[PDB]
Ligand binder design. Structure first.
Ligand SMILES: [Ca+2]
Ligand SMILES: [Ca+2]
Length: 167
């Protein structure tokens, strides 16, 4: 496959809890804002029902901050071409009922190209997909996933298989 993003399924990363949030995971930038007093646990998990490969990323939300983006996992770099339309697809599920995630893509100047907004994540793996167009002249963009919804407190959200494909 040809994909714009790197390590979309976490398969390059050693299993374990991630403490180096910015650079612990190839292809991703994880971040927790200082308003999150009870920090989440980010973990690359080896599990037999990973949708892709052997690994997934697990995000255990123990608290939240002021905005959903105060807990986020961002695919970076995402290599694209001006004016091209892309398909975004990812798989997600949660440990418990009642999870919410927004899947977004934007540039380095914090212009958003598109998103799937407050998606309802269930206890079973589902695909989440949308299209977006690089409507400016950027070639290296980012794909922030927002986890910091109050509804997620006490839950673990799993993601796998991010693929951003030239449509
Ligand atoms: Ca995987
Ligand atoms: Ca990084």
């Amino acid at each position: 496959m040809l994909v714009a993003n790197i390590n979309g399924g976490f398969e390059s990363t050693p299993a374990g809890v991630v403490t180096d949030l910015a650079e612990g995971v190839e292809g991703w930038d994880l971040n927790v804002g200082s308003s999150v007093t009870n920090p989440p646990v980010f973990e690359v998990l080896e599990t037999s029902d990973a949708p892709e490969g052997n690994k997934v990323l697990a995000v255990t939300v123990n608290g939240v901050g002021n905005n959903p983006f105060n807990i986020q996992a961002t695919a970076l770099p995402v290599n694209v071409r001006p004016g091209v339309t892309y398909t975004y697809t990812i798989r997600a599920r949660a440990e418990q009922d009642g999870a919410v995630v927004s899947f977004t893509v934007g540039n380095q100047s914090f212009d958003e190209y598109g998103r799937l907004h407050h998606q309802q994540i269930t206890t079973e793996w589902q695909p989440f997909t949308f299209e977006f167009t690089v409507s400016d002249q950027e070639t290296v963009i980012r794909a922030p996933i927002h986890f910091g919804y109050a509804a997620n407190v006490g839950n673990t959200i799993y993601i796998d298989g991010l693929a951003i494909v030239d449509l």
